[PDB]
């Protein structure tokens with residue numbers, strides 16, 4: 001079966017260009033499309049950026065136990081649907097959940113073999129620029145981002161996004177090393193290992 | 199302090215070209231020079247490939263508890279001197295022990311924070327070349343016989359294509375430096391600034 005990767009970053013900027021770039025260079029890796037109850041933004045496509053749904057429909061899915069994890073982020077509900085994750089892993093494909101620290105905690109309990117990565121800004125100034133890209137609102141968004149970053153200690157690996165080219169290669173190294181671990185290689189090269197041992 | 203890496207292969211696939219190439223691209227990483235009692239081979243230099251010594255002197259060193267690990271391989275004795283390992287790690291340098299599965303077990307027992315990598319051939323045919331025609335068969339039988347110890351290693355690298363295997367090794371070393379503990383030490387000041395309110 002495939003490997004599950006959790007990738008988290010401060011939520012105020014949206015999903016990271018780093019993960020998009022990683023997926024562009026490794027088309028065999030899949031990414032989960034989350035459900036959300038927030039409204040669509042210009043340039044977003046239902047079924048691609050998110051499965052956009054209603055709060056009533058989101059809660060009904062929760063009652064039907066369809067979410068691997070869910071969380072409230074800035075008052076809107078987000079979640080990872082479980083069936084798609086199980087299907088993709090069972091096909092032997094690796095996949096990424098780009099989710100916040102709350103969802104990461106839930107996933108780790110259910111899947112202790114999951115690799116998790118937190119992507120950090122190089123400075124508060126750089127984080128603030130990404131958020132501003134109203135002043136009063138900005139400081140609250142910064143305080144909320146700081147509270148999320150405090151959870152970086154819960155993650156297996158950390159990437160400091162100082163130089164985009166360097167951070168992308170750092171992500172690639174984490175993913176490649178994960179696939180070289182004993183557990184993944186034993187399954188991947190099962191037939192080879194049998195020939196080496198017989 | 200530095201990280202200790204154990205790099206192993208089936209017994210007889212000696213000090214690998216892969217590790218040398220990795221060291222060329224990793225100037226902060228050192229490699230331990232092993233002691234051996236086998237005779238020098240053409241092109242080998244005492245103090246570089248090995249510390250070549252006698253069996254009686256090897257046993258005297260063993261009696262003085264100077265070896266972190268030691269093992270018999272094809273009837274010859276090999277070992278890692280402990281003082282150099284401790285000094286190198288305490289200087290903050292990473293280091294590689296290129297040793298067999300027996301030495302790996304001893305090092306894991308004494309230093310559970312050590313990380314380990316097993317380098318696998320793509321086939322038995324490929325292993326045979328790397329290993330007298332009779333001498334080749336004795337090395338092949340021993341290497342195949344103890345192949346199962348790959349399961350004890352943290353990562354596995356298939357040495358099919360040299361460049362691909364080298365990139366695999368590099369990714370393992372880089373991922374270790376991206377681990378929570380290494381990054382917390384590297385970015386302590388930054389992390390404190392990010393969390394300060």
Ligand SMILES: Nc1nc2c(ncn2[C@@H]2O[C@H](COP(=O)(O)O)[C@@H](O)[C@H]2O)c(=O)[nH]1
Nearest residue numbers: 011014015034071073078079080099100103
């Ligand atoms: N737990 C959880 N968090 C999510 C999920 N999808 C997105 N998020 C988080 O919600 C944040 C806000 O996303 P945005 O509204 O900008 O698209 C993201 O930065 C990410 O941290 C999800 O399925 N589960």
Ligand SMILES: Nc1nc2c(ncn2[C@@H]2O[C@H](COP(=O)(O)O)[C@@H](O)[C@H]2O)c(=O)[nH]1
Nearest residue numbers: 210211212232269271276277278297298301
């Ligand atoms: N335990 C242990 N094995 C070693 C050491 N140095 C070399 N070896 C093993 O001895 C094998 C034979 O090496 P060679 O004699 O061809 O140079 C190597 O493939 C490696 O498995 C050492 O210091 N300790």
